[PDB]
Amino acid sequence: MELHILEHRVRVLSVARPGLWLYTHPLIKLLFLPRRSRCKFFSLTETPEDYTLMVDEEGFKELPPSEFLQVAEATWLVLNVSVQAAGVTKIARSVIAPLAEHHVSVLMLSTYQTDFILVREQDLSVVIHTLAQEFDIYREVGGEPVPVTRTVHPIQSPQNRFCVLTLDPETLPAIATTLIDVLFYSTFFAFSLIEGYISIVMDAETQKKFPSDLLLTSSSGELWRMVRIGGQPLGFDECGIVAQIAGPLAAADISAYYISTFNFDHALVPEDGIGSVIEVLQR
Amino acid sequence: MELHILEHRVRVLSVARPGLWLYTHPLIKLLFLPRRSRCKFFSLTETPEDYTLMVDEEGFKELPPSEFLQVAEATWLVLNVSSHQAAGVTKIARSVIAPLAEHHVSVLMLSTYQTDFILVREQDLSVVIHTLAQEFDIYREVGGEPVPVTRHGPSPTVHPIQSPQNRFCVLTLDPETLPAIATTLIDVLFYSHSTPKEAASSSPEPSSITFFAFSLIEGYISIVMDAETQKKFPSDLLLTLWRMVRIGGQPLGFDECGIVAQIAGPLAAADISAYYISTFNFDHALVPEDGIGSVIEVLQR
Numbered sequence: 310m311e312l313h314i315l316e317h318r319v320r321v322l323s324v325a326r327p328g329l330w331l332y333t334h335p336l337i338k339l340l341f342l343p344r345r346s347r348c349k350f351f352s353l354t355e356t357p358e359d360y361t362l363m364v365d366e367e368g369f370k371e372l373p374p375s376e377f378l379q380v381a382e383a384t385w386l387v388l389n390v391s392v393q394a395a396g397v398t399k400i401a402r403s404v405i406a407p408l409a410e411h412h413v414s415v416l417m418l419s420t421y422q423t424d425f426i427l428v429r430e431q432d433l434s435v436v437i438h439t440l441a442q443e444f445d446i447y448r449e450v451g452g453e454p455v456p457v458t459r460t461v462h463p464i465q466s467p468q469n470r471f472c473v474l475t476l477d478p479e480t481l482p483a484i485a486t487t488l489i490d491v492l493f494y495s496t497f498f499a500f501s502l503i504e505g506y507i508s509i510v511m512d513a514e515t516q517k518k519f520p521s522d523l524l525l526t527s528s529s530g531e532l533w534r535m536v537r538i539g540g541q542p543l544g545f546d547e548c549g550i551v552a553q554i555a556g557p558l559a560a561a562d563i564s565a566y567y568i569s570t571f572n573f574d575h576a577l578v579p580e581d582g583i584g585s586v587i588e589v590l591q592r
Numbered sequence: 593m594e595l596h597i598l599e600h601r602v603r604v605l606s607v608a609r610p611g612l613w614l615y616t617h618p619l620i621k622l623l624f625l626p627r628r629s630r631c632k633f634f635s636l637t638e639t640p641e642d643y644t645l646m647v648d649e650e651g652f653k654e655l656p657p658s659e660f661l662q663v664a665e666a667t668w669l670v671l672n673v674s675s676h677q678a679a680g681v682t683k684i685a686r687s688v689i690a691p692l693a694e695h696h697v698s699v700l701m702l703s704t705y706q707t708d709f710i711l712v713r714e715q716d717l718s719v720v721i722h723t724l725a726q727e728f729d730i731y732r733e734v735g736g737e738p739v740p741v742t743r744h745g746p747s748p749t750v751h752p753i754q755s756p757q758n759r760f761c762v763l764t765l766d767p768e769t770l771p772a773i774a775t776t777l778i779d780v781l782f783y784s785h786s787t788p789k790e791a792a793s794s795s796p797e798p799s800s801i802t803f804f805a806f807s808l809i810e811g812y813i814s815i816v817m818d819a820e821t822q823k824k825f826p827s828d829l830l831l832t833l834w835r836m837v838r839i840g841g842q843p844l845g846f847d848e849c850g851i852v853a854q855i856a857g858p859l860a861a862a863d864i865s866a867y868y869i870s871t872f873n874f875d876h877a878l879v880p881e882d883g884i885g886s887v888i889e890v891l892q893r
């Protein structure tokens with residue numbers, strides 16, 4: 310029905326782990342102090358390779374250049390589609406496969422609340438032409454929608470069990486010192502704060518570290534297994550990577566959250582279905 | 593009547609305000625993550641010019657060198673007199689401050705909500721003991737328990753003073769409350785606009801000065817903050833005004849003696865309470881707000 314080009318203009322960055330200390334001051338601001346910046350799109354993911362940041366242009370300005378900070382080419386726009394499978398599965402045929410077929414490279418950010426599909430600004434007219442025959446397409450300007458006018462990659466699954474959680478923004482101060490400890494002083498951990506909504510992906514072991522009654526989910530105890538996608542770093546030009554994972558999962562009707570980082574892709578699937586997901590993906 | 597030499601070996605440092613972002617990672621650790629360091633003595637004072645740190649040797653290892661980090665030469669020991677007239681350093685002006693200055697022992701002061709600490713350089717300890725053993729029964733803290741003790745600067749001058757008009761409160765907190773106020777404390781300390789540099793010569797009575805003192809010493813929390821800044825926190829968490837006299841024109845260094853004495857002496861004769869906090873560059877006496885006029889008059893004599 311409806312595809313929205315959100316008001317965000319996003320840069321994609323990698324912070325090398327030995328340099329994270331240098332970015333503590335701006336990241337604490339972007340995580341916890343909304344009155345100190347105009348950033349409305351913030352996503353931070355920790356991997357064994359780096360910290361990946363996706364931030365809008367205003368949040369980007371808070372990050373000083375250094376030898377520890379890599380910035381992917383291009384400014385990325387954020388797409389969002391308006392009972393269904395969780396995560397990317399419900400947009401695999403309608404968004405992911407058509408963009409791959411038309412050679413538009415994407416970055417995925419599934420969150421607790423919704424699925425963001427990032428595309429480079431240069432591809433906007435192809436995105437519109439490709440998706441207009443299923444969606445009425447709108448651009449968000451001033452908070453309101455305006456109608457638009459004129460290779461097989463290796464996979465692996467570590468044993469970690471993951472939680473997909475949200476948080477009432479009014480309680481973010483109450484978890485701040487634990488979140489700080491986990492991110493800066495302590496492997497996959499994702500935190501995003503986008504248009505005021507918080508989404509967190511966290512190891513079941515890491516969840517034990519937080520105060521008991523603050524992290525929220527509509528499915529208590531629902532755990533996910535991660536499928537890491539890619540052997541060498543994936544870059545930002547190769548298309549069809551999400552599609553070769555999300556396509557088979559949609560055909561099997563298996564829910565999957567999907568998160569791109571700077572170097573790799575990650576699908577989160579129901580923990581009890583990890584065997585059937587691996588089988589499906591090896592076909 | 594008792595004087596206690598505490599179990600802290602302290603380094604005194606300054607992070608120049610423009611370099612603060614480089615030190616946010618260690619400072620956040622020392623403020624909020626006790627399981628991450630063996631530090632038992634941590635004092636952070638924000639001024640318009642810098643963040644002064646007094647930190648024990650374990651906390652000191654968290655702070656790597658840079659152009660924005662100044663470290664005072666000496667390793668400092670910490671003295672305390674429990675005595676329960678005017679309060680604060682005024683109570684020890686004649687018994688501790690003046691004798692140490694007369695015997696050329698340079699001090700640093702750190703008043704907290706809980707008590708008044710006097711820091712001295714470790715190489716002066718023998719002179720300190722010999723000077724104060726007549727009036728005080730001296731004990732040294734070993735493993736948390738008191739054990740009886742039985743065994744280059746400019747010449748002193750009268751320093752200029754400055755009397756900012758804002759009002760300060762002295763507060764403590766339940767340590768279990770520290771996590772709940774962390775984001776506000778972080779915002780106040782590290783993300784807030786500050787007053788521009790103002791010398792005493794051109795600004796004898798500034799309307800306001802940026803000044804926030806936080807200490808965590810053996811688990812006890814002490815905070816000195818502008819009264820206006822209390823409103824940013826919740827009222828049931830802050831456990832409970834004062835005017836500041838800032839002392840110095842040029843940075844005071846660590847070797848001139850008799851600076852505290854020239855303030856605490858007259859205040860004792862006027863029976864005026866005074867909290868006293870040394871930072872890397874200047875000294876700060878906090879006096880009851882309704883007495884500031886008398887205080888300025890006595891100091892200007």
Ligand SMILES: NC(=[NH2+])NCCC[C@H](N)C(=O)O
Nearest residue numbers: 415543548549550551571573
């Ligand atoms: N850095 C990355 N995670 N790259 C892979 C992202 C997905 C890929 N660009 C696609 O269109 O299918």
Ligand SMILES: NC(=[NH2+])NCCC[C@H](N)C(=O)O
Nearest residue numbers: 698699844849850851852874
């Ligand atoms: N950096 C400073 N605040 N120096 C002044 C401290 C007091 C001075 N050493 C005295 O013995 O009286």
